[PDB]
Design an enzyme around this catalytic site. Structure first.
Site, PDB file in Angstrom:
ATOM      1  N   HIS A  50      64.999  85.469  11.622  1.00  0.00           N
ATOM      2  CA  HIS A  50      64.492  86.811  11.885  1.00  0.00           C
ATOM      3  C   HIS A  50      65.538  87.915  11.869  1.00  0.00           C
ATOM      4  O   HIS A  50      65.207  89.078  11.655  1.00  0.00           O
ATOM      5  CB  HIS A  50      63.736  86.838  13.209  1.00  0.00           C
ATOM      6  CG  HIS A  50      63.014  88.122  13.455  1.00  0.00           C
ATOM      7  ND1 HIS A  50      62.112  88.650  12.555  1.00  0.00           N
ATOM      8  CD2 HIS A  50      63.074  88.997  14.488  1.00  0.00           C
ATOM      9  CE1 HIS A  50      61.650  89.795  13.023  1.00  0.00           C
ATOM     10  NE2 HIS A  50      62.216  90.029  14.194  1.00  0.00           N
ATOM     11  N   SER A  95      60.327  93.903  11.329  1.00  0.00           N
ATOM     12  CA  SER A  95      59.605  93.356  12.477  1.00  0.00           C
ATOM     13  C   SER A  95      58.476  94.350  12.714  1.00  0.00           C
ATOM     14  O   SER A  95      57.721  94.672  11.800  1.00  0.00           O
ATOM     15  CB  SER A  95      60.523  93.318  13.708  1.00  0.00           C
ATOM     16  OG  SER A  95      60.483  92.068  14.375  1.00  0.00           O
TER      17      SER A  95
HETATM   18  O1  X99 Z   1      59.754  89.600  18.209  1.00  0.00           O
HETATM   19  C1  X99 Z   1      58.822  90.353  18.498  1.00  0.00           C
HETATM   20  C2  X99 Z   1      58.467  90.639  19.950  1.00  0.00           C
HETATM   21  C3  X99 Z   1      58.645  92.093  20.298  1.00  0.00           C
HETATM   22  C4  X99 Z   1      60.085  92.179  20.826  1.00  0.00           C
HETATM   23  F1  X99 Z   1      60.111  92.934  21.951  1.00  0.00           F
HETATM   24  F2  X99 Z   1      60.874  92.728  19.869  1.00  0.00           F
HETATM   25  C5  X99 Z   1      60.572  90.750  21.152  1.00  0.00           C
HETATM   26  N1  X99 Z   1      59.356  89.960  20.897  1.00  0.00           N
HETATM   27  C6  X99 Z   1      59.002  88.751  21.361  1.00  0.00           C
HETATM   28  O2  X99 Z   1      58.092  88.096  20.838  1.00  0.00           O
HETATM   29  C7  X99 Z   1      59.883  88.220  22.220  1.00  0.00           C
HETATM   30  C8  X99 Z   1      59.539  86.746  22.518  1.00  0.00           C
HETATM   31  N2  X99 Z   1      60.187  86.370  23.761  1.00  0.00           N
HETATM   32  C9  X99 Z   1      59.575  86.301  24.953  1.00  0.00           C
HETATM   33  O3  X99 Z   1      58.417  86.592  25.190  1.00  0.00           O
HETATM   34  C10 X99 Z   1      60.561  85.845  25.997  1.00  0.00           C
HETATM   35  C11 X99 Z   1      60.437  85.621  27.379  1.00  0.00           C
HETATM   36  C12 X99 Z   1      61.603  85.213  28.054  1.00  0.00           C
HETATM   37  C13 X99 Z   1      62.824  85.029  27.372  1.00  0.00           C
HETATM   38  C14 X99 Z   1      62.933  85.255  25.988  1.00  0.00           C
HETATM   39  C15 X99 Z   1      61.770  85.663  25.322  1.00  0.00           C
HETATM   40  C16 X99 Z   1      61.488  86.014  23.880  1.00  0.00           C
HETATM   41  O4  X99 Z   1      62.330  85.983  22.982  1.00  0.00           O
HETATM   42  N3  X99 Z   1      58.087  90.967  17.556  1.00  0.00           N
HETATM   43  C17 X99 Z   1      58.283  90.802  16.118  1.00  0.00           C
HETATM   44  C18 X99 Z   1      57.028  91.449  15.530  1.00  0.00           C
HETATM   45  C19 X99 Z   1      56.664  92.495  16.510  1.00  0.00           C
HETATM   46  C20 X99 Z   1      57.018  91.937  17.858  1.00  0.00           C
END
Ligand code: X99
Length: 707
Positions: free
Chosen positions: A677, A551
């Protein structure tokens, strides 16, 4: 083996604020095309054998089954009049949910996800009990997708209900205390697929309210922001179940909006959009509901508190110049999470130098009452609500699988005792040693890093070290137990090392903000200075060093191989981000812009362009230098970080760097099926993965096996 012929579309020129950049493999962004699927089959067609030809891959896998075959337990947690806990007898695909009428009674199976799929690819994701604990709601994600489906069950006798909710993603789950229904989030019916193989962007998430016993089609939409496609609001009820606190997010930052609605003010129930009262109507700080006494609500915040603190807000006297500080921000210690228990008890868990500490304060004043003793490590589970009169917390560390503690808070003398404990026969802690050093980065900043190695090893750069890091999104990589990494330490005589580079949250938002946006390069520098450290103090050498990450992690490892390929001899990037230019156009990518920036901005493009993995691959200028062996790992149902990133990044490597004659090292990729993922990956698949990762290393660095 020879790398497969991939068609380059030299006509794919796009203009980014003037600069012209080519994406000859942009056609790899179509998952359902015949060309893409041929590319995929073709790559796995050369990697699978390769991975299988290493005999260690079998020795590892065998030792993995054994050592990983130990009882995994979750904290007991009481809902209503019954107790609950997740438990894996050892090698079961997915953990099971057991229930008991009494901490001392026999316990039966309440939910076994293992019977829903012959291969463990269907998994529980999210769950919420009614206030009375008589009804249960759970979402299940198929094949690793983020997409979920909520079903319902009647706790008593475990009854399946006809209720079913579809099109749910990144949603909350909150039962009104009247037990009439539940709040949840769903997306608009988009054209195309919705199983985790699509890449369509996700916008216009709404808040709906499901009334038990009805069709989803009759659900009550309670909130929407049609002028804002990115806002995502989760809801939850105050302890007294009178207020509904809606937290509005936009991006991954630790900041939100706090709107509330006095359920007791609704003309006549929840019949539609609610009369939301806009308390904190801005994205300047994080406000985390802990508990509330009357109108006085207590929230964990970071408003002018990089390390977080505690504050009280009376909804009758909202003005900020009135909020009362209950527990001031600690100058150096970060406040991870706070839980209210036994009514007026507050359990705070701090991060002291990437080590968890558990305390206990008085809700009334905030004074410290007790310190719960823990060794160096991480608190991984907790179970204690306002109505409970007892807590349960799990402790894990590099060498300890876990210890569950218990504590009856109804006793005068608060003395905690071991409730459950588990050792992994086949491994002996006394044989290894954990140390935490602090090395300086390219700019002076002292960065922490943990190092596990056997007692007695002589620092002569003759050992194969596995360096791990993530750096970003305020995530803190604290001490955890990984059998798969220990085996490495004892059966390959390796050195484990984890670096807490900037961008993470180990030191408040200032650690987070020091490795994001215009300073993202600060983590690559931070993580490079770590290899140089291990190498300098004779832990390992360049040709025998391995750097893993996934990630945000995988992007880090991929950029470090592009910037200093002479530092490591092996790289393993899991489901990583590679295209920093088009990353925001897929699934939920738009939410990451808060850490990276947006190629749509003339000013953000300059930071990205300089490190975007996919656009900085180059053939080393030095004769004696070449790219490290690289293994990219990803699956077809990863809708979090769509496969096109790795797919495109690999075509690029085999072409630019792969095709030259001085590159003897491999550039492989492996695309799993029915996997996403990462979350919910069934045991079987998990084992299979680490076996590759480490087999690859053994064959690449030519590492022997130690019985
Ligand atoms: O998956 C991710 C990023 C960084 C993380 F903090 F790890 C998590 N993330 C997210 O994209 C988390 C996405 N996400 C929200 O924004 C959200 C709001 C409310 C409830 C649930 C969710 C949820 O799963 N990434 C993969 C690539 C780098 C960032």
């Amino acid at each position: 083996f020879q790398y497969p012929d991939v068609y380059r579309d030299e006509t794919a020129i796009q203009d980014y604020h003037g600069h012209k950049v080519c994406d000859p493999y942009a056609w790899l962004e179509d998952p359902d095309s015949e060309q893409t699927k041929a590319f995929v089959e073709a790559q796995n067609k050369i990697t699978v054998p390769f991975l299988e030809q290493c005999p260690i891959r079998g020795l590892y896998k065998e030792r993995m089954t054994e050592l990983y075959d130990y009882p995994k337990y979750s904290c007991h947690f009481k809902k209503g009049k019954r107790y609950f806990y997740f438990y894996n007898t050892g090698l079961q695909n997915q953990r099971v949910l057991y229930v008991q009428d009494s901490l001392e009674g026999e316990a039966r199976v309440f939910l076994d996800p293992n019977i829903l799929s012959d291969d463990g690819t269907v998994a529980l994701r999210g769950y919420a009990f009614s206030e009375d604990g008589e009804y249960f709601a759970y979402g299940l994600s198929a094949s690793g997708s983020d997409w979920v489906t909520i079903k319902f069950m009647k706790v008593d006798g475990a009854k399946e209900l006809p209720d079913v909710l579809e099109r749910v993603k990144f949603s909350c789950m909150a039962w009104t205390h009247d037990g009439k229904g539940m709040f949840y989030n769903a997306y608009p019916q988009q054209d195309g697929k919705s199983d985790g193989t699509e890449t369509s962007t996700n916008l216009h998430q709404k808040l709906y309210y499901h009334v038990l016993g009805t069709d989803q089609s009759e659900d009550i939409l309670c909130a929407e922001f049609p002028d804002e496609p990115k806002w995502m609001g989760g809801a939850e009820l105050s302890d007294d179940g009178r207020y509904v606190l809606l937290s509005i997010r936009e991006g991954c930052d630790p900041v939100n909006r706090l709107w509330y609605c006095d359920l007791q003010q609704e003309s006549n129930g929840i019949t539609g959009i609610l009369k939301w009262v806009k308390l904190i109507d801005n994205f300047e700080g994080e406000y985390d509901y802990v508990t509330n006494e009357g109108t006085v609500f207590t929230f964990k915040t970071n408003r002018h508190s990089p390390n977080y603190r505690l504050i009280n807000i009376d909804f009758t006297d909202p003005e900020e110049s009135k909020w009362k500080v209950l527990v001031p921000e600690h100058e150096k210690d970060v406040l991870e999470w706070v839980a209210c228990v036994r009514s007026n008890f507050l359990v705070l868990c701090y991060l002291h130098d990437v080590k968890n500490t558990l305390q206990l304060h008085d809700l009334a004043t905030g004074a410290l009452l007790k310190i719960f003793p823990l060794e160096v490590g991480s608190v991984v589970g907790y179970s204690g609500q306002k109505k409970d009169t007892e807590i349960f917390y799990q402790f894990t560390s590099f060498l300890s699988p876990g210890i569950i503690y218990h504590c009856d808070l109804t006793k005068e003398e608060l003395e905690p005792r071991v409730f459950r404990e588990v050792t992994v026969k086949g491994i002996d802690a006394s044989d290894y040693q954990t140390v935490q050093i602090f090395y300086p980065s390219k700019d002076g900043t002292k960065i922490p890093m943990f190092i596990v190695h056997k007692k007695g090893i002589k620092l002569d750069g003759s050992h194969p070290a596995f360096l791990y890091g993530y750096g970003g999104f305020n995530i803190s990589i604290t001490p955890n137990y990984s059998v798969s990494r220990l085996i490495f330490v004892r059966h390959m005589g390796g050195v484990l090392a984890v670096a807490n580079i900037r961008g993470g949250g180990e030191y408040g938002e200032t650690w987070h903000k020091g490795g994001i946006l215009a300073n993202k390069q600060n983590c690559f520098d931070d993580f490079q200075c770590a290899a140089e450290y291990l190498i300098k103090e004779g832990y390992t050498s360049p040709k025998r060093l391995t750097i893993n990450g996934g990630s945000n992690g995988g992007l880090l490892v991929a950029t470090c191989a592009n910037q200093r390929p002479d530092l490591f001899g092996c790289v393993i990037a899991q489901v990583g981000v590679m295209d920093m230019l088009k990353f925001h156009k897929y699934t939920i990518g738009h939410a990451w812009t808060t850490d990276y920036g947006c190629s749509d901005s003339k000013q953000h493009f300059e930071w990205l362009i300089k490190y975007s993995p996919l656009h900085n691959v180059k053939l080393p200028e030095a004769d004696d230098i070449q790219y490290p062996s690289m293994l990219l790992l990803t699956a077809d149902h990863d809708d979090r970080v769509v496969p096109l990133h790795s797919l495109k990044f690999i075509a690029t490597l085999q072409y630019i760097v792969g095709r030259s004659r001085k590159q003897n090292n491999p550039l492989l990729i492996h695309v799993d099926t029915k996997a996403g993922h990462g979350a919910g990956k069934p045991t079987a698949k998990v084992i299979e993965e680490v076996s590759d990762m480490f087999a690859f290393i053994a064959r690449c660095l030519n590492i022997d096996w130690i019985p």
